RNA sequence: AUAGGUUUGGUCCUAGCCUUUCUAUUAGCUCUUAGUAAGAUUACACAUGCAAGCAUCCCCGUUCCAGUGAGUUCACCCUCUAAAUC
């Protein structure tokens, strides 16, 4: 299928100063191997973004494309998983600032 | 301890190798031991030994003078002990060095 | 015929998965054709140098 | 010459006694950690070294595969391993003949030593398969005919045989002939 | 690497030591050394008798049918004994040899007859 | 990865010149008849063709 | 002493004492947890303790953790054909998440042993090379058949000496 | 070994490539066997090439991988 | 059908003839030492820790089975006349192969006659333990496995590592197998220490040995001289069973005997010792009378 | 590291350097046999001998082995896919 390594990949917006494109903060856990520690690790990523629906601070999962675009951009946006302030809560499926109902789930 | 009567044991000295405080603080370590049977009586456990030479065969070494305490000892997952980075690096053999296993004369 | 160790494996594979079908293992040798030492090749497979 | 006499003798237990032959040796070196190998002998040619290992110190003490209280006192007693030659005190050579003494003891039985109760090799311990029972013959074989039968020699008629002197005239060898069948 | 142009070849590869032949049969490149990168080990063949004597032969026959099957050519040796174990029919020039044998013992035994 | 410039321009000439300036079989397949030995090659022929 | 106010969760048995292998679907594993609150408190040692191990069995899974962002602490899973799984963690231990886990999308010991029967299906003891990846070099060893010449010497029949 | 580049020795500028004298009925004979036991080793190995390509062929689709396929699939959802 | 060593009633009742001894399965041996753990626990964990123990012992002294001897092999697949001549000694060829079991891989052997002929039993075993190599056996015959080697051995009072030597050496169903593992049964009833060979997995096979091949008369004396009561009738049972056509089952299931009367018919009918055996039950029940007064 | 020597008029602490262990190269002195492993310091210059032929002409191979450590993240995994072997 596709030649992107980086299948799905869930990471933090940057910078929206290009357009229809994202700039992507993506950490994962490295494994510092003599201190026996995990510490995060970040890569940049570059997204396609057609609608300029995710600003910066936002966390969004990026899939893989089956050829890359341009030189960098390997990768689009799929869904805004956290938009900044507006989180609405999945679990009960509701929005919220943080820690705290916005509207009561009691509703 | 060829005085005492002691034969098996491993002891590594660090910091000063004073010969006075190594006496010392040696005497006072080996005064305050304590023993299997005064384990058993301070917890009110039996005390067992598992070897692995003889296999799954429980011995019993040290049972309380007293009453048996009925409330299993409580299982902490995950322990907060303080481990030592010497050990820990031996028993992952990181511990490089052309000093330690060396072939020497009796005892 | 089948080479006597391949028959000796195949008969006994055939005995463990069942039946015992004593038939005389064969294999077909018509399929494969007969070109001797004299049939030419193409230039185009081969190349001048 | 035989040995098992000196360590139920007296001079056993007068010289030495319960402790071991090699509970009195100090070997001499740099100071700290003694170098990680013995001397290779005490007898070179047929003098001895000024400090001589528990073994070639007397040369009553005998070592064989019949020696039973001198090969338990040299292999360890709370573990089945063979003390080296740096914790004993004997030489290289000592040491290896200990070795094969202690290896020659425990095939000959004359040694205590723990064998682990191992497990089957095999799940399935039937004994009806091809490789392992009797196999349907070949036609060849309840007949005479050689297998394959292109092995055999049979002669060609003289019309190829012509031409092939036709292809390789000028160079050409000897004729043919039959094979011999038995050999001497 | 890349070895322009060649196949792979089930070939007997020597690892032994001076007047002491051992040979490991191996799935090596054509274009390869004869002691360097196998894909695959597929056997051993000790040429020296034993103690009792038996020149021993190991064979991993189905890794050797996968082999032929994706396209290993094998080499003369190696259809030698496989001959000789009958996964392989016998080769023509080892039964050749065998009958160049049988001649030149009947050409000894016709002339020591006639010296004696 | 700096770029090979100069040869890739040698593959491009030498194949030019091989399509242009190719031996012909006149020149390729003759033979001095009397001692067996072609031209351009400087090989003799084997003993099944003499 | 090592550092830390737990320093087993750095030990390489800890680490490879956790049990939860995940299976191939799963690609991104997101945690936001709760650090106040008693209701968060199983989550917040599951994050504490057994992240490490899960990223050790799982060394390619992408491990996101989130902090206070929802009232509610919860695992997501987002999953290679698209599928995002939530799991709440509300009212839980972290034995409970890690049990959940295993069940939900944590392989199972059928493919974990069978995984492990084709490592040592790769691994083959008739096999004659050096020791970093066979078991003998040579048949030099077995008794019975030629000893190496360097051990013991070969007789008078090696050539040179013919 | 050499290359294309290394010089010929002369020793090689002139030396007679003299044939192998030949015998009548053992190389005939070399001919029908050669045929028959390449006939027959293309015979084992087209059989072998057919084996190697059914168990490709079942390991990427038999019916004990639909089996497994879909019973994974049942126990996800 | 005659029931053979694979059946439940004749394995529980071995399995109950060789009893557990804890402190004899699972015994101190001189192997490399690590420092010992130590565990803190109340009445109830001490009672799992002695079930799962228990369990372990009877995994431990799951028995050995006991099979018959193996036909020696004889079959030639080929034989090429043409190949008789040409190479000196002969050539073995193994499938080596990973999965398929080891009775069912095949090895043959080339001979200088041009035989193809299937490899013998001891040439497999030898083929398979250089191939794919097992602990503890060595391709070389051991030099331990000779008569005053072993009579040595069976002196210094060791058969249950005998067994031991023997099972990692032979396979179960060879001939050198059953040859060793009979003297060795064979010393034991000679000298008889039935207790050394309690608690060990041989003990019921020199059992099914015994009762197959009859010398159970040791076994009845040791079994009422340890007051092993219980085992010695399910012995008489055993031997009823296994020979049902015997006089002394004929009386037993006339008399309707269930017990000690079941010894007494044995003793009576065929044992080689009757006058013995019957003269020790008669002192296990004045013992019977003296601790019944004591009760 | 099972550690030891050394600051001082002396003691304690911290500290460096050194010793004791093992291997490789070279130098000195001195050297009996047998077997086996390994064997330019220099990407400096090379006399000379050889190291690529085969083969009914065509082709094929000389683009492989063998060598060196100059340079140096072109070595590993995935996708795609051209020689090549079936
Ligand atoms: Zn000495
Ligand atoms: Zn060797």
């Given at each position: 299928?596709?030649?992107?390594?980086?299948?799905?990949?869930?990471?933090?917006?940057?910078?929206?100063?290009?357009?229809?494109?994202?700039?992507?903060?993506?950490?994962?856990?490295?494994?510092?191997?003599?201190?026996?520690?995990?510490?995060?690790?970040?890569?940049?990523?570059?997204?396609?973004?057609?609608?300029?629906?995710?600003?910066?601070?936002?966390?969004?999962?990026?899939?893989?494309?089956?050829?890359?675009?341009?030189?960098?951009?390997?990768?689009?946006?799929?869904?805004?998983?956290?938009?900044?302030?507006?989180?609405?809560?999945?679990?009960?499926?509701?929005?919220?600032?943080?820690?705290?109902?916005?509207?009561?789930?009691?509703? | 301890?060829?005085?005492?009567?002691?034969?098996?044991?491993?002891?590594?000295?660090?910091?000063?190798?004073?010969?006075?405080?190594?006496?010392?603080?040696?005497?006072?370590?080996?005064?305050?031991?304590?023993?299997?049977?005064?384990?058993?009586?301070?917890?009110?456990?039996?005390?067992?030994?598992?070897?692995?030479?003889?296999?799954?065969?429980?011995?019993?070494?040290?049972?309380?003078?007293?009453?048996?305490?009925?409330?299993?000892?409580?299982?902490?997952?995950?322990?907060?002990?303080?481990?030592?980075?010497?050990?820990?690096?031996?028993?992952?053999?990181?511990?490089?060095?052309?000093?330690?296993?060396?072939?020497?004369?009796?005892? | 015929?089948?080479?006597?160790?391949?028959?000796?494996?195949?008969?006994?594979?055939?005995?463990?998965?069942?039946?015992?079908?004593?038939?005389?293992?064969?294999?077909?040798?018509?399929?494969?054709?007969?070109?001797?030492?004299?049939?030419?090749?193409?230039?185009?497979?081969?190349?001048?140098? | 010459?035989?040995?098992?006499?000196?360590?139920?003798?007296?001079?056993?237990?007068?010289?030495?006694?319960?402790?071991?032959?090699?509970?009195?040796?100090?070997?001499?070196?740099?100071?700290?950690?003694?170098?990680?190998?013995?001397?290779?002998?005490?007898?070179?040619?047929?003098?001895?070294?000024?400090?001589?290992?528990?073994?070639?110190?007397?040369?009553?003490?005998?070592?064989?595969?019949?020696?039973?209280?001198?090969?338990?006192?040299?292999?360890?007693?709370?573990?089945?391993?063979?003390?080296?030659?740096?914790?004993?005190?004997?030489?290289?050579?000592?040491?290896?003949?200990?070795?094969?003494?202690?290896?020659?003891?425990?095939?000959?039985?004359?040694?205590?030593?723990?064998?682990?109760?191992?497990?089957?090799?095999?799940?399935?311990?039937?004994?009806?398969?091809?490789?392992?029972?009797?196999?349907?013959?070949?036609?060849?074989?309840?007949?005479?005919?050689?297998?394959?039968?292109?092995?055999?020699?049979?002669?060609?008629?003289?019309?190829?045989?012509?031409?092939?002197?036709?292809?390789?005239?000028?160079?050409?060898?000897?004729?043919?002939?039959?094979?011999?069948?038995?050999?001497? | 690497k890349?070895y322009?142009g060649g196949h792979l070849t089930i070939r007997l590869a020597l690892g032994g030591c001076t007047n002491r032949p051992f040979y490991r049969i191996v799935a090596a490149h054509n274009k390869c050394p004869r002691d360097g990168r196998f894909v695959e080990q597929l056997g051993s063949y000790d040429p020296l008798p034993n103690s009792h004597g038996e020149k021993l032969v190991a064979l991993n026959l189905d890794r050797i049918r996968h082999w032929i099957?994706c396209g290993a050519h094998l080499s003369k040796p190696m259809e030698k004994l496989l001959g000789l174990a009958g996964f392989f029919?016998l080769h023509?020039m080892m039964?050749?040899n065998?009958?160049?044998?049988?001649?030149?013992?009947?050409?000894?035994?016709?002339?020591?007859?006639?010296?004696? | 990865?700096?770029?090979?410039?100069?040869?890739?321009?040698?593959?491009?000439?030498?194949?030019?010149?091989?399509?242009?300036?190719?031996?012909?079989?006149?020149?390729?397949?003759?033979?001095?008849?009397?001692?067996?030995?072609?031209?351009?090659?400087?090989?003799?022929?084997?003993?099944?063709?003499? | 002493?090592?550092?830390?106010?737990?320093?087993?969760?750095?030990?390489?048995?800890?680490?490879?004492?956790?049990?939860?292998?995940?299976?191939?679907?799963?690609?991104?594993?997101?945690?936001?947890?709760?650090?106040?609150?008693?209701?968060?408190?199983?989550?917040?040692?599951?994050?504490?303790?057994?992240?490490?191990?899960?990223?050790?069995?799982?060394?390619?899974?992408?491990?996101?953790?989130?902090?206070?962002?929802?009232?509610?602490?919860?695992?997501?899973?987002?999953?290679?054909?698209?599928?995002?799984?939530?799991?709440?963690?509300?009212?839980?231990?972290?034995?409970?998440?890690?049990?959940?886990?295993?069940?939900?999308?944590?392989?199972?010991?059928?493919?974990?042993?069978?995984?492990?029967?084709?490592?040592?299906?790769?691994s083959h003891p008739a096999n004659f090379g050096p020791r970093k990846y066979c078991l003998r070099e040579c048949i030099c060893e077995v008794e019975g058949q030629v000893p190496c010449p360097s051990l013991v010497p070969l007789p008078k029949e090696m050539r040179g000496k013919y | 070994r050499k290359?294309?580049?290394?010089?010929?020795?002369?020793?090689?500028?002139?030396?007679?490539?003299?044939?192998?004298?030949?015998?009548?009925?053992?190389?005939?004979?070399?001919?029908?066997?050669?045929?028959?036991?390449?006939?027959?080793?293309?015979?084992?190995?087209?059989?072998?090439?057919?084996?190697?390509?059914?168990?490709?062929?079942?390991?990427?689709?038999?019916?004990?991988?639909?089996?497994?396929?879909?019973?994974?699939?049942?126990?996800?959802? | 059908?005659?029931?053979?060593?694979?059946?439940?009633?004749?394995?529980?009742?071995?399995?109950?003839?060789?009893?557990?001894?804890?402190?004899?399965?699972?015994?101190?041996?001189?192997?490399?030492?690590?420092?010992?753990?130590?565990?803190?626990?109340?009445?109830?964990?001490?009672?799992?820790?002695?079930?799962?123990?228990?369990?372990?012992?009877?995994?431990?002294?799951?028995?050995?089975?006991?099979?018959?001897?193996?036909?020696?092999?004889?079959?030639?697949?080929?034989?090429?006349?043409?190949?008789?001549?040409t190479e000196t000694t002969k050539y073995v060829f193994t499938d080596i192969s990973?999965?398929?079991?080891?009775?069912?891989?095949?090895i043959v052997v080339r001979?200088?006659?041009?035989?193809?002929?299937?490899?013998?039993?001891?040439?497999?075993?030898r083929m398979?333990?250089v191939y794919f190599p097992?602990?503890?056996?060595?391709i070389?015959?051991?030099?331990?496995?000779?008569?005053?080697?072993?009579?040595?051995?069976?002196?210094?009072?060791?058969?249950?590592?005998?067994?031991?030597?023997?099972?990692?050496?032979?396979?179960?169903?060879?001939?050198?197998?059953?040859?060793?593992?009979?003297?060795?049964?064979?010393?034991?009833?000679?000298?008889?220490?039935?207790?050394?060979?309690?608690?060990?997995?041989?003990?019921?096979?020199?059992?099914?040995?015994?009762?197959?091949?009859?010398?159970?008369?040791?076994?009845?004396?040791?079994?009422?001289?340890?007051?092993?009561?219980?085992?010695?009738?399910?012995?008489?049972?055993?031997?009823?069973?296994?020979?049902?056509?015997?006089?002394?089952?004929?009386?037993?299931?006339?008399?309707?005997?269930?017990?000690?009367?079941?010894?007494?018919?044995?003793?009576?009918?065929?044992?080689?010792?009757?006058?013995?055996?019957?003269?020790?039950?008669?002192?296990?029940?004045?013992?019977?009378?003296?601790?019944?007064?004591?009760?």
């Amino acid at each position: 299928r596709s030649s992107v390594h980086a299948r799905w990949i869930v990471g933090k917006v940057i910078g929206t100063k290009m357009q229809k494109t994202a700039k992507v903060r993506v950490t994962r856990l490295v494994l510092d191997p003599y201190l026996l520690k995990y510490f995060n690790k970040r890569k940049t990523y570059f997204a396609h973004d057609a609608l300029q629906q995710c600003t910066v601070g936002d966390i969004v999962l990026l899939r893989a494309l089956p050829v890359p675009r341009a030189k960098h951009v390997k990768h689009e946006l799929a869904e805004i998983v956290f938009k900044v302030g507006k989180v609405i809560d999945p679990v009960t499926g509701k929005p919220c600032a943080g820690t705290t109902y916005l509207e009561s789930p009691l509703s | 301890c060829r005085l005492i009567g002691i034969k098996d044991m491993y002891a590594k000295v660090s910091g000063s190798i004073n010969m006075l405080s190594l006496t010392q603080g040696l005497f006072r370590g080996l005064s305050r031991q304590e023993t299997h049977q005064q384990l058993a009586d301070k917890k009110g456990l039996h005390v067992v030994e598992i070897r692995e030479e003889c296999g799954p065969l429980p011995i019993v070494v040290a049972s309380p003078r007293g009453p048996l305490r009925k409330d299993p000892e409580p299982e902490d997952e995950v322990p907060d002990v303080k481990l030592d980075w010497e050990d820990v690096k031996t028993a992952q053999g990181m511990k490089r060095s052309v000093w330690s296993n060396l072939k020497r004369a009796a005892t | 015929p089948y080479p006597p160790l391949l028959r000796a494996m195949i008969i006994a594979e055939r005995q463990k998965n069942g039946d015992t079908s004593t038939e005389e293992p064969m294999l077909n040798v018509q399929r494969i054709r007969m070109e001797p030492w004299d049939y030419p090749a193409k230039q185009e497979d081969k190349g001048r140098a | 010459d035989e040995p098992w006499k000196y360590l139920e003798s007296e001079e056993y237990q007068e010289r030495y006694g319960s402790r071991p032959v090699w509970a009195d040796y100090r070997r001499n070196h740099k100071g700290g950690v003694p170098p990680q190998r013995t001397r290779k002998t005490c007898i070179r040619r047929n003098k001895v070294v000024g400090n001589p290992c528990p073994i070639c110190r007397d040369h009553k003490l005998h070592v064989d595969f019949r020696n039973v209280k001198l090969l338990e006192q040299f292999v360890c007693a709370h573990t089945g391993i063979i003390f080296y030659a740096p914790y004993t005190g004997v030489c290289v050579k000592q040491h290896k003949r200990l070795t094969q003494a202690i290896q020659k003891a425990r095939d000959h039985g004359l040694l205590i030593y723990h064998i682990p109760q191992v497990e089957p090799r095999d799940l399935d311990f039937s004994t009806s398969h091809g490789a392992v029972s009797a196999t349907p013959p070949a036609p060849t074989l309840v007949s005479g005919d050689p297998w394959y039968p292109w092995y055999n020699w049979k002669q060609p008629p003289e019309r190829e045989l012509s031409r092939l002197r036709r292809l390789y005239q000028g160079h050409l060898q000897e004729e043919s002939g039959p094979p011999p069948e038995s050999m001497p | 690497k890349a070895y322009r142009g060649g196949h792979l070849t089930i070939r007997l590869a020597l690892g032994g030591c001076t007047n002491r032949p051992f040979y490991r049969i191996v799935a090596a490149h054509n274009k390869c050394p004869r002691d360097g990168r196998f894909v695959e080990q597929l056997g051993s063949y000790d040429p020296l008798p034993n103690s009792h004597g038996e020149k021993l032969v190991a064979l991993n026959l189905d890794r050797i049918r996968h082999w032929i099957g994706c396209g290993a050519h094998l080499s003369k040796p190696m259809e030698k004994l496989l001959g000789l174990a009958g996964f392989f029919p016998l080769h023509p020039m080892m039964i050749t040899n065998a009958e160049r044998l049988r001649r030149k013992r009947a050409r000894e035994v016709l002339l020591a007859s006639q010296k004696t | 990865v700096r770029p090979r410039l100069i040869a890739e321009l040698a593959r491009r000439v030498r194949a030019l010149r091989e399509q242009l300036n190719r031996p012909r079989d006149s020149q390729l397949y003759a033979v001095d008849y009397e001692t067996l030995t072609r031209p351009f090659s400087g090989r003799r022929l084997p003993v099944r063709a003499w | 002493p090592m550092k830390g106010r737990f320093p087993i969760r750095r030990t390489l048995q800890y680490l490879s004492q956790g049990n939860v292998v995940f299976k191939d679907s799963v690609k991104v594993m997101t945690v936001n947890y709760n650090t106040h609150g008693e209701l968060g408190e199983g989550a917040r040692k599951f994050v504490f303790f057994n992240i490490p191990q899960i990223q050790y069995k799982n060394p390619w899974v992408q491990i996101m953790m989130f902090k206070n962002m929802t009232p509610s602490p919860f695992l997501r899973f987002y999953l290679d054909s698209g599928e995002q799984v939530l799991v709440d963690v509300e009212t839980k231990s972290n034995k409970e998440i890690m049990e959940h886990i295993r069940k939900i999308l944590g392989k199972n010991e059928e493919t974990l042993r069978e995984e492990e029967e084709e490592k040592k299906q790769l691994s083959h003891p008739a096999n004659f090379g050096p020791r970093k990846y066979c078991l003998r070099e040579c048949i030099c060893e077995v008794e019975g058949q030629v000893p190496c010449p360097s051990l013991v010497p070969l007789p008078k029949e090696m050539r040179g000496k013919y | 070994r050499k290359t294309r580049h290394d010089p010929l020795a002369k020793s090689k500028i002139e030396r007679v490539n003299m044939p192998p004298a030949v015998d009548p009925a053992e190389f005939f004979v070399l001919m029908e066997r050669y045929q028959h036991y390449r006939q027959t080793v293309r015979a084992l190995r087209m059989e072998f090439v057919s084996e190697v390509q059914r168990k490709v062929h079942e390991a990427r689709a038999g019916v004990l991988a639909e089996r497994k396929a879909l019973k994974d699939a049942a126990e996800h959802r | 059908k005659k029931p053979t060593f694979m059946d439940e009633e004749v394995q529980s009742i071995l399995t109950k003839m060789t009893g557990l001894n804890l402190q004899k399965t699972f015994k101190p041996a001189i192997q490399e030492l690590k420092p010992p753990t130590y565990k803190l626990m109340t009445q109830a964990q001490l009672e799992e820790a002695t079930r799962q123990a228990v369990e372990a012992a009877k995994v431990r002294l799951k028995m050995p089975p006991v099979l018959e001897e193996r036909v020696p092999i004889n079959d030639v697949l080929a034989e090429d006349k043409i190949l008789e001549g040409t190479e000196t000694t002969k050539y073995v060829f193994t499938d080596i192969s990973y999965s398929i079991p080891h009775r069912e891989r095949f090895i043959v052997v080339r001979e200088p006659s041009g035989t193809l002929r299937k490899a013998s039993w001891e040439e497999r075993d030898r083929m398979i333990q250089v191939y794919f190599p097992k602990e503890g056996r060595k391709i070389l015959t051991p030099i331990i496995f000779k008569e005053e080697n072993l009579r040595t051995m069976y002196s210094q009072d060791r058969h249950v590592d005998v067994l031991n030597l023997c099972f990692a050496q032979f396979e179960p169903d060879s001939t050198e197998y059953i040859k060793v593992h009979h003297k060795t049964y064979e010393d034991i009833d000679k000298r008889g220490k039935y207790d050394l060979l309690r608690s060990t997995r041989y003990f019921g096979g020199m059992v099914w040995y015994f009762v197959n091949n009859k010398k159970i008369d040791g076994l009845l004396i040791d079994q009422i001289q340890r007051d092993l009561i219980d085992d010695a009738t399910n012995l008489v049972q055993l031997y009823h069973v296994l020979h049902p056509d015997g006089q002394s089952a004929q009386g037993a299931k006339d008399q309707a005997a269930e017990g000690i009367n079941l010894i007494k018919v044995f003793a009576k009918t065929e044992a080689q010792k009757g006058a013995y055996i019957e003269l020790t039950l008669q002192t296990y029940q004045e013992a019977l009378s003296r601790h019944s007064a004591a009760s």
